[PDB]
RNA sequence: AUCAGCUUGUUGGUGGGGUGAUGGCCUACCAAGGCGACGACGGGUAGCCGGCCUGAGAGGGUGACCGGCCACACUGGGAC
RNA sequence: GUGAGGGAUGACGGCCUUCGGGUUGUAAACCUCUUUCAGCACAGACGAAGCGCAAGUGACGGUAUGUGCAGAAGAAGGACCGGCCAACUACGUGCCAGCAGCCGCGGUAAUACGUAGGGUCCGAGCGUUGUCCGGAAUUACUGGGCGUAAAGAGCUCGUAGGUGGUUUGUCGCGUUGUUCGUGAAAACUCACAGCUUAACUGUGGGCGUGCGGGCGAUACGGGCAGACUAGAGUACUGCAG
RNA sequence: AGUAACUGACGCUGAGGAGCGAAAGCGUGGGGAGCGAACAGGAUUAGAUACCCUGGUAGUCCACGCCGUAAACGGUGGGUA
RNA sequence: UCGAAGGUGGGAUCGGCGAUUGGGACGAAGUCGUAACAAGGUAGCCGUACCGGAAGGUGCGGCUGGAUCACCUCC
């Protein structure tokens, strides 16, 4: 299989992890 | 799968996507023209498509396409809307019926008149 | 483990047939001997016999090939299997190859073919198809 | 309704003559219109549709009635082709025309519709009337001396009467022995194409 | 008299430094309508030439279909590449019921009444190959009786024997 | 199951009561059961069927007319 | 039902043109014929072996129908024509106006837009929208798959469940045969009959794929009571890591 | 593996469930030579939050526990003929 | 006694709005960079951790779904 699919999945995962890191304290305080 | 797997879980059919959810099970709906304007199609084509914003009786705000050459629609105009997709416009799934309620049949049409609400010449 | 001896017998027959073997040996049981009898009487195999093995008895089956080395069996399928078993009434007996094949049916009168069962008006379990 | 427009149009389009003695079709055997000479593309659907149009324009039967006939013929325990052909041939107007009492099928239909005939002793004016075994079709006495029947009864030298019918009286009685079989029908075209078309 | 069926014409191309070089491939069926059919696949720079090569190749490879009167002997299922075509005999007067490629092959082979369905790989070449593979799986009842060394009545149903009698009478 | 626990006249017995009739149907006392992943308890939706439409068939959708049963009669209780 | 037969080096007009001519087109005009259904006049029901011991009694209805009269006389539209998918040209416009179910067509020479000729399909209908099934084997019981296309849990142990070697006897649960009861009528299907035909209506079979009771069989599955050692495990003797 | 002495179908799979499960990471307490995220300079570059160089903290190691993921791949579930 | 409706109370559950705020999809031509595909010019990817305007960089373990290995003298 082409690595293009892995690249799309990894970019989605990386962006989501960045978003989670950017709002850790906000999530902790709202939950 | 195994027959036992089938008798344990069975087969679940694919779900059906509801089309033209604003009509609510009716062939047509009556609406009022929220705003009447023009807009441009997708990139491969180019024109000034005539599109109206209609508030239906199902309390759904819907954008509808006006077929034919010329139209006389303005604000607060009662129109009768039907289902139909326009490939160029991204999210337009409805068309205004010509010759019904306020919207008028087009002028000087002699072929496919019934599709544009033009009466036969006397 | 071994679940279907009948299916194993049918697959031994099929594998030997595809490889043009003239002989196939398998452990013996009454059911296997009876379907072997039906196969021989219907002309699908040459002949069969039972020797004695180290523990029990064996089944020896001779495969029939034509003069030009063409197989006398075109297919062997197991219909009723452990798990999903198949029973047919005397009126809805299956047809194999539009009647050109033979369907073995286990009735209370013994092992019969589809035509024999239809003539005698009995039903049972559809063991296999031969064509 | 009925088809009323020109007749040779259909014959020219379908490539065969349906009336039988039409000189215009012989003069120009090609489709009508400006582009009647343009070469056509070959397609099985086109041939099947043309066969069906041939059948339903020879007998003057509209599409819905023809589909009803096809369903009836398929339902019957014969075979579809000759069953459909025999259902078509049993219509009263076709019987009248095939008995030599009408030069063309159109005038046979016109005569039947005007109540000039009388089947089994009861007046019948329905061209789609189907005719069974041992039916006696008579002309009512009032119309015996009319011009059409006069010229029909003194030119009995045209197309031969098929076996399954028999004009028996000097008053031109019609007796039906049995419904025709495929051998005696003597019709153009091919029924198998119609069966293929309606199975699509 | 030989009937022919050009079932598909495709414009293929190979790339070169200058550009694209287009040729034509035609799949042609040749038969006599009496029980023999042939399949040809010719390629040339021009459509009529490719059709000619397909016709000659189809004529070279001939194969006899075991018809019984007007239909095939028994139901069969043939698979070639990813194409699956099932065949089923039908009572007289039913007509040919098949898709375009299968219909062409069967009409060329002389089959009049048959139920045929395509069950995969809509590609015309592979559908034709699968139809031919199915037709090659048919067995004449006499050969079946010969294989099992039995009289023709003990092997075939009486309906087939009656059908053969009527066909040979006609 | 992105609804896992539910039930205290609730599960059973005895004596009474009640009813056209059997029966926690009601009652006093006694015992602690009963149901549930073979999905109880919740949430959503729905009158059910002969049939009807589609399909090669299996199956899918549906319950208009006609015919059977059910439920209701402004909303909620109640008896005569 | 809106007509039928005959009717030409094939009228006019329209349209195209290679300017020759071709198509509308046997179509029309004209000459005969018939009048269905409409229109007018006359007669006029069955439904009622009914109801009533009164003399009469039909809402539909003076309807259906029948017979006369006159005259082709009063009676055709809709969609589509790039491919799927029957059916092509001209003019106008030019990335506009627009079309479109998909592919996609509009860039002054568009068979895809608009209009006219021509054509095709249907026809008192013809198209559009909405909803369901089919095509879709695209939830695959019939009838699909999982190395790389979506799809083998990271790997084991094990609970409920599913499934199970050879053989003897027995049961008759499943399975199978037959019989009885039931499966309303209607519907569906076959045949026949009545409406002038058909739709429709009636009659007689089948169907009602099922369930319940009796009787028969025991090959297979299962239960019960045994037996065997080829699976599985233990014992003993060695062995490699 | 061999002998086959023993039992006599005691087998297979297994929803859920339980256990084990690289590295990184987390907690408590030790240890810390080398390597080395982060971090510092140097260089290259138009710019270098990099590649290269010099340093270098967590970590890597041990004890006891968490975590429960991987290209945990033969991208190939288990049993049998 | 039971008992509809009504009243009081504390919770369940389903939705709408919400100042502000997060990401997603699409958009010929805007700005910043070159990350991947040819060894893509530091092989790529997987889990994890840290860091950075951004693609991304680096450590640890793993995978090949990674390219090239000329000449190579004795026989």
JSON list of N, CA and C in Angstrom, two decimals, chain D residues 110-159:
[
{"chain": "D", "resi": 110, "resn": "UNK", "atom": "N", "xyz": [-62.92, 0.35, -39.39]},
{"chain": "D", "resi": 110, "resn": "UNK", "atom": "CA", "xyz": [-63.97, 1.34, -39.53]},
{"chain": "D", "resi": 110, "resn": "UNK", "atom": "C", "xyz": [-65.34, 0.69, -39.66]},
{"chain": "D", "resi": 111, "resn": "UNK", "atom": "N", "xyz": [-65.41, -0.40, -40.43]},
{"chain": "D", "resi": 111, "resn": "UNK", "atom": "CA", "xyz": [-66.67, -1.11, -40.60]},
{"chain": "D", "resi": 111, "resn": "UNK", "atom": "C", "xyz": [-67.12, -1.74, -39.29]},
{"chain": "D", "resi": 112, "resn": "UNK", "atom": "N", "xyz": [-66.19, -2.37, -38.56]},
{"chain": "D", "resi": 112, "resn": "UNK", "atom": "CA", "xyz": [-66.55, -3.00, -37.30]},
{"chain": "D", "resi": 112, "resn": "UNK", "atom": "C", "xyz": [-67.04, -1.96, -36.31]},
{"chain": "D", "resi": 113, "resn": "UNK", "atom": "N", "xyz": [-66.33, -0.83, -36.22]},
{"chain": "D", "resi": 113, "resn": "UNK", "atom": "CA", "xyz": [-66.68, 0.18, -35.23]},
{"chain": "D", "resi": 113, "resn": "UNK", "atom": "C", "xyz": [-68.04, 0.81, -35.51]},
{"chain": "D", "resi": 114, "resn": "UNK", "atom": "N", "xyz": [-68.49, 0.78, -36.75]},
{"chain": "D", "resi": 114, "resn": "UNK", "atom": "CA", "xyz": [-69.76, 1.38, -37.11]},
{"chain": "D", "resi": 114, "resn": "UNK", "atom": "C", "xyz": [-70.93, 0.43, -36.94]},
{"chain": "D", "resi": 115, "resn": "UNK", "atom": "N", "xyz": [-70.69, -0.75, -36.38]},
{"chain": "D", "resi": 115, "resn": "UNK", "atom": "CA", "xyz": [-71.76, -1.70, -36.15]},
{"chain": "D", "resi": 115, "resn": "UNK", "atom": "C", "xyz": [-72.35, -2.28, -37.41]},
{"chain": "D", "resi": 116, "resn": "UNK", "atom": "N", "xyz": [-71.52, -2.58, -38.40]},
{"chain": "D", "resi": 116, "resn": "UNK", "atom": "CA", "xyz": [-71.99, -3.21, -39.62]},
{"chain": "D", "resi": 116, "resn": "UNK", "atom": "C", "xyz": [-72.02, -4.73, -39.51]},
{"chain": "D", "resi": 117, "resn": "UNK", "atom": "N", "xyz": [-71.46, -5.29, -38.45]},
{"chain": "D", "resi": 117, "resn": "UNK", "atom": "CA", "xyz": [-71.37, -6.73, -38.29]},
{"chain": "D", "resi": 117, "resn": "UNK", "atom": "C", "xyz": [-72.21, -7.18, -37.11]},
{"chain": "D", "resi": 118, "resn": "UNK", "atom": "N", "xyz": [-72.28, -8.49, -36.93]},
{"chain": "D", "resi": 118, "resn": "UNK", "atom": "CA", "xyz": [-73.13, -9.07, -35.90]},
{"chain": "D", "resi": 118, "resn": "UNK", "atom": "C", "xyz": [-72.61, -10.47, -35.62]},
{"chain": "D", "resi": 119, "resn": "UNK", "atom": "N", "xyz": [-72.01, -10.66, -34.45]},
{"chain": "D", "resi": 119, "resn": "UNK", "atom": "CA", "xyz": [-71.33, -11.90, -34.10]},
{"chain": "D", "resi": 119, "resn": "UNK", "atom": "C", "xyz": [-72.25, -12.73, -33.21]},
{"chain": "D", "resi": 120, "resn": "UNK", "atom": "N", "xyz": [-72.45, -13.99, -33.59]},
{"chain": "D", "resi": 120, "resn": "UNK", "atom": "CA", "xyz": [-73.26, -14.92, -32.82]},
{"chain": "D", "resi": 120, "resn": "UNK", "atom": "C", "xyz": [-74.68, -14.41, -32.60]},
{"chain": "D", "resi": 121, "resn": "UNK", "atom": "N", "xyz": [-75.18, -13.61, -33.53]},
{"chain": "D", "resi": 121, "resn": "UNK", "atom": "CA", "xyz": [-76.54, -13.11, -33.43]},
{"chain": "D", "resi": 121, "resn": "UNK", "atom": "C", "xyz": [-76.73, -11.89, -32.56]},
{"chain": "D", "resi": 122, "resn": "UNK", "atom": "N", "xyz": [-75.66, -11.33, -32.00]},
{"chain": "D", "resi": 122, "resn": "UNK", "atom": "CA", "xyz": [-75.75, -10.11, -31.21]},
{"chain": "D", "resi": 122, "resn": "UNK", "atom": "C", "xyz": [-74.84, -9.07, -31.85]},
{"chain": "D", "resi": 123, "resn": "UNK", "atom": "N", "xyz": [-75.35, -7.85, -31.98]},
{"chain": "D", "resi": 123, "resn": "UNK", "atom": "CA", "xyz": [-74.58, -6.78, -32.60]},
{"chain": "D", "resi": 123, "resn": "UNK", "atom": "C", "xyz": [-73.33, -6.49, -31.78]},
{"chain": "D", "resi": 124, "resn": "UNK", "atom": "N", "xyz": [-72.19, -6.47, -32.45]},
{"chain": "D", "resi": 124, "resn": "UNK", "atom": "CA", "xyz": [-70.90, -6.23, -31.81]},
{"chain": "D", "resi": 124, "resn": "UNK", "atom": "C", "xyz": [-70.19, -5.15, -32.60]},
{"chain": "D", "resi": 125, "resn": "UNK", "atom": "N", "xyz": [-69.85, -4.05, -31.94]},
{"chain": "D", "resi": 125, "resn": "UNK", "atom": "CA", "xyz": [-69.05, -3.00, -32.57]},
{"chain": "D", "resi": 125, "resn": "UNK", "atom": "C", "xyz": [-67.90, -2.68, -31.63]},
{"chain": "D", "resi": 126, "resn": "UNK", "atom": "N", "xyz": [-66.88, -3.53, -31.68]},
{"chain": "D", "resi": 126, "resn": "UNK", "atom": "CA", "xyz": [-65.69, -3.41, -30.86]},
{"chain": "D", "resi": 126, "resn": "UNK", "atom": "C", "xyz": [-64.57, -4.06, -31.67]},
{"chain": "D", "resi": 127, "resn": "UNK", "atom": "N", "xyz": [-63.69, -3.29, -32.30]},
{"chain": "D", "resi": 127, "resn": "UNK", "atom": "CA", "xyz": [-62.61, -3.93, -33.07]},
{"chain": "D", "resi": 127, "resn": "UNK", "atom": "C", "xyz": [-61.75, -4.85, -32.23]},
{"chain": "D", "resi": 128, "resn": "UNK", "atom": "N", "xyz": [-61.49, -4.50, -30.99]},
{"chain": "D", "resi": 128, "resn": "UNK", "atom": "CA", "xyz": [-60.67, -5.38, -30.17]},
{"chain": "D", "resi": 128, "resn": "UNK", "atom": "C", "xyz": [-61.40, -6.62, -29.72]},
{"chain": "D", "resi": 129, "resn": "UNK", "atom": "N", "xyz": [-62.59, -6.91, -30.22]},
{"chain": "D", "resi": 129, "resn": "UNK", "atom": "CA", "xyz": [-63.30, -8.13, -29.84]},
{"chain": "D", "resi": 129, "resn": "UNK", "atom": "C", "xyz": [-62.52, -9.35, -30.30]},
{"chain": "D", "resi": 130, "resn": "UNK", "atom": "N", "xyz": [-62.30, -10.28, -29.38]},
{"chain": "D", "resi": 130, "resn": "UNK", "atom": "CA", "xyz": [-61.58, -11.50, -29.69]},
{"chain": "D", "resi": 130, "resn": "UNK", "atom": "C", "xyz": [-62.56, -12.61, -30.05]},
{"chain": "D", "resi": 131, "resn": "UNK", "atom": "N", "xyz": [-62.20, -13.40, -31.04]},
{"chain": "D", "resi": 131, "resn": "UNK", "atom": "CA", "xyz": [-63.10, -14.36, -31.66]},
{"chain": "D", "resi": 131, "resn": "UNK", "atom": "C", "xyz": [-62.67, -15.77, -31.26]},
{"chain": "D", "resi": 132, "resn": "UNK", "atom": "N", "xyz": [-63.63, -16.56, -30.78]},
{"chain": "D", "resi": 132, "resn": "UNK", "atom": "CA", "xyz": [-63.37, -17.90, -30.29]},
{"chain": "D", "resi": 132, "resn": "UNK", "atom": "C", "xyz": [-63.66, -18.93, -31.38]},
{"chain": "D", "resi": 133, "resn": "UNK", "atom": "N", "xyz": [-63.70, -20.20, -30.99]},
{"chain": "D", "resi": 133, "resn": "UNK", "atom": "CA", "xyz": [-64.04, -21.27, -31.91]},
{"chain": "D", "resi": 133, "resn": "UNK", "atom": "C", "xyz": [-65.53, -21.29, -32.20]},
{"chain": "D", "resi": 134, "resn": "UNK", "atom": "N", "xyz": [-65.87, -21.62, -33.45]},
{"chain": "D", "resi": 134, "resn": "UNK", "atom": "CA", "xyz": [-67.26, -21.75, -33.90]},
{"chain": "D", "resi": 134, "resn": "UNK", "atom": "C", "xyz": [-68.06, -20.46, -33.68]},
{"chain": "D", "resi": 135, "resn": "UNK", "atom": "N", "xyz": [-67.56, -19.36, -34.22]},
{"chain": "D", "resi": 135, "resn": "UNK", "atom": "CA", "xyz": [-68.30, -18.11, -34.23]},
{"chain": "D", "resi": 135, "resn": "UNK", "atom": "C", "xyz": [-68.79, -17.80, -35.63]},
{"chain": "D", "resi": 136, "resn": "UNK", "atom": "N", "xyz": [-70.02, -17.30, -35.71]},
{"chain": "D", "resi": 136, "resn": "UNK", "atom": "CA", "xyz": [-70.65, -16.95, -36.97]},
{"chain": "D", "resi": 136, "resn": "UNK", "atom": "C", "xyz": [-70.75, -15.43, -37.01]},
{"chain": "D", "resi": 137, "resn": "UNK", "atom": "N", "xyz": [-70.02, -14.82, -37.93]},
{"chain": "D", "resi": 137, "resn": "UNK", "atom": "CA", "xyz": [-70.01, -13.37, -38.09]},
{"chain": "D", "resi": 137, "resn": "UNK", "atom": "C", "xyz": [-70.85, -13.04, -39.31]},
{"chain": "D", "resi": 138, "resn": "UNK", "atom": "N", "xyz": [-71.87, -12.22, -39.13]},
{"chain": "D", "resi": 138, "resn": "UNK", "atom": "CA", "xyz": [-72.79, -11.88, -40.19]},
{"chain": "D", "resi": 138, "resn": "UNK", "atom": "C", "xyz": [-72.87, -10.37, -40.35]},
{"chain": "D", "resi": 139, "resn": "UNK", "atom": "N", "xyz": [-73.23, -9.95, -41.55]},
{"chain": "D", "resi": 139, "resn": "UNK", "atom": "CA", "xyz": [-73.53, -8.55, -41.83]},
{"chain": "D", "resi": 139, "resn": "UNK", "atom": "C", "xyz": [-75.02, -8.34, -41.62]},
{"chain": "D", "resi": 140, "resn": "UNK", "atom": "N", "xyz": [-75.38, -7.32, -40.86]},
{"chain": "D", "resi": 140, "resn": "UNK", "atom": "CA", "xyz": [-76.79, -7.08, -40.61]},
{"chain": "D", "resi": 140, "resn": "UNK", "atom": "C", "xyz": [-77.49, -6.70, -41.91]},
{"chain": "D", "resi": 141, "resn": "UNK", "atom": "N", "xyz": [-78.77, -7.07, -42.00]},
{"chain": "D", "resi": 141, "resn": "UNK", "atom": "CA", "xyz": [-79.50, -6.97, -43.26]},
{"chain": "D", "resi": 141, "resn": "UNK", "atom": "C", "xyz": [-79.53, -5.55, -43.80]},
{"chain": "D", "resi": 142, "resn": "UNK", "atom": "N", "xyz": [-79.58, -4.55, -42.92]},
{"chain": "D", "resi": 142, "resn": "UNK", "atom": "CA", "xyz": [-79.69, -3.17, -43.38]},
{"chain": "D", "resi": 142, "resn": "UNK", "atom": "C", "xyz": [-78.48, -2.76, -44.22]},
{"chain": "D", "resi": 143, "resn": "UNK", "atom": "N", "xyz": [-77.30, -3.29, -43.92]},
{"chain": "D", "resi": 143, "resn": "UNK", "atom": "CA", "xyz": [-76.07, -2.88, -44.57]},
{"chain": "D", "resi": 143, "resn": "UNK", "atom": "C", "xyz": [-75.61, -3.86, -45.64]},
{"chain": "D", "resi": 144, "resn": "UNK", "atom": "N", "xyz": [-76.43, -4.85, -45.99]},
{"chain": "D", "resi": 144, "resn": "UNK", "atom": "CA", "xyz": [-76.01, -5.83, -46.99]},
{"chain": "D", "resi": 144, "resn": "UNK", "atom": "C", "xyz": [-75.88, -5.19, -48.37]},
{"chain": "D", "resi": 145, "resn": "UNK", "atom": "N", "xyz": [-76.75, -4.25, -48.69]},
{"chain": "D", "resi": 145, "resn": "UNK", "atom": "CA", "xyz": [-76.76, -3.63, -50.01]},
{"chain": "D", "resi": 145, "resn": "UNK", "atom": "C", "xyz": [-75.88, -2.40, -50.10]},
{"chain": "D", "resi": 146, "resn": "UNK", "atom": "N", "xyz": [-75.12, -2.08, -49.06]},
{"chain": "D", "resi": 146, "resn": "UNK", "atom": "CA", "xyz": [-74.28, -0.90, -49.08]},
{"chain": "D", "resi": 146, "resn": "UNK", "atom": "C", "xyz": [-73.14, -1.07, -50.08]},
{"chain": "D", "resi": 147, "resn": "UNK", "atom": "N", "xyz": [-72.60, 0.06, -50.51]},
{"chain": "D", "resi": 147, "resn": "UNK", "atom": "CA", "xyz": [-71.50, 0.05, -51.47]},
{"chain": "D", "resi": 147, "resn": "UNK", "atom": "C", "xyz": [-70.29, -0.75, -50.98]},
{"chain": "D", "resi": 148, "resn": "UNK", "atom": "N", "xyz": [-69.78, -0.56, -49.76]},
{"chain": "D", "resi": 148, "resn": "UNK", "atom": "CA", "xyz": [-68.59, -1.32, -49.35]},
{"chain": "D", "resi": 148, "resn": "UNK", "atom": "C", "xyz": [-68.79, -2.82, -49.43]},
{"chain": "D", "resi": 149, "resn": "UNK", "atom": "N", "xyz": [-69.92, -3.32, -48.92]},
{"chain": "D", "resi": 149, "resn": "UNK", "atom": "CA", "xyz": [-70.14, -4.76, -48.94]},
{"chain": "D", "resi": 149, "resn": "UNK", "atom": "C", "xyz": [-70.46, -5.24, -50.35]},
{"chain": "D", "resi": 150, "resn": "UNK", "atom": "N", "xyz": [-71.09, -4.40, -51.16]},
{"chain": "D", "resi": 150, "resn": "UNK", "atom": "CA", "xyz": [-71.28, -4.74, -52.56]},
{"chain": "D", "resi": 150, "resn": "UNK", "atom": "C", "xyz": [-69.94, -5.02, -53.23]},
{"chain": "D", "resi": 151, "resn": "UNK", "atom": "N", "xyz": [-69.01, -4.08, -53.13]},
{"chain": "D", "resi": 151, "resn": "UNK", "atom": "CA", "xyz": [-67.72, -4.28, -53.78]},
{"chain": "D", "resi": 151, "resn": "UNK", "atom": "C", "xyz": [-66.88, -5.32, -53.07]},
{"chain": "D", "resi": 152, "resn": "UNK", "atom": "N", "xyz": [-67.19, -5.62, -51.81]},
{"chain": "D", "resi": 152, "resn": "UNK", "atom": "CA", "xyz": [-66.47, -6.68, -51.13]},
{"chain": "D", "resi": 152, "resn": "UNK", "atom": "C", "xyz": [-66.94, -8.06, -51.58]},
{"chain": "D", "resi": 153, "resn": "UNK", "atom": "N", "xyz": [-68.21, -8.18, -51.96]},
{"chain": "D", "resi": 153, "resn": "UNK", "atom": "CA", "xyz": [-68.77, -9.48, -52.30]},
{"chain": "D", "resi": 153, "resn": "UNK", "atom": "C", "xyz": [-68.71, -9.80, -53.79]},
{"chain": "D", "resi": 154, "resn": "UNK", "atom": "N", "xyz": [-68.19, -8.90, -54.62]},
{"chain": "D", "resi": 154, "resn": "UNK", "atom": "CA", "xyz": [-68.02, -9.19, -56.04]},
{"chain": "D", "resi": 154, "resn": "UNK", "atom": "C", "xyz": [-66.57, -9.10, -56.49]},
{"chain": "D", "resi": 155, "resn": "UNK", "atom": "N", "xyz": [-65.63, -8.97, -55.56]},
{"chain": "D", "resi": 155, "resn": "UNK", "atom": "CA", "xyz": [-64.21, -9.08, -55.84]},
{"chain": "D", "resi": 155, "resn": "UNK", "atom": "C", "xyz": [-63.56, -10.07, -54.88]},
{"chain": "D", "resi": 156, "resn": "UNK", "atom": "N", "xyz": [-64.16, -11.26, -54.76]},
{"chain": "D", "resi": 156, "resn": "UNK", "atom": "CA", "xyz": [-63.59, -12.29, -53.90]},
{"chain": "D", "resi": 156, "resn": "UNK", "atom": "C", "xyz": [-62.49, -13.05, -54.63]},
{"chain": "D", "resi": 157, "resn": "UNK", "atom": "N", "xyz": [-61.56, -12.32, -55.23]},
{"chain": "D", "resi": 157, "resn": "UNK", "atom": "CA", "xyz": [-60.45, -12.92, -55.94]},
{"chain": "D", "resi": 157, "resn": "UNK", "atom": "C", "xyz": [-59.12, -12.41, -55.44]},
{"chain": "D", "resi": 158, "resn": "UNK", "atom": "N", "xyz": [-59.18, -11.59, -54.39]},
{"chain": "D", "resi": 158, "resn": "UNK", "atom": "CA", "xyz": [-57.99, -11.04, -53.76]},
{"chain": "D", "resi": 158, "resn": "UNK", "atom": "C", "xyz": [-57.36, -12.08, -52.85]},
{"chain": "D", "resi": 159, "resn": "UNK", "atom": "N", "xyz": [-56.52, -11.63, -51.92]},
{"chain": "D", "resi": 159, "resn": "UNK", "atom": "CA", "xyz": [-55.76, -12.46, -50.99]},
{"chain": "D", "resi": 159, "resn": "UNK", "atom": "C", "xyz": [-56.56, -13.66, -50.52]}
]
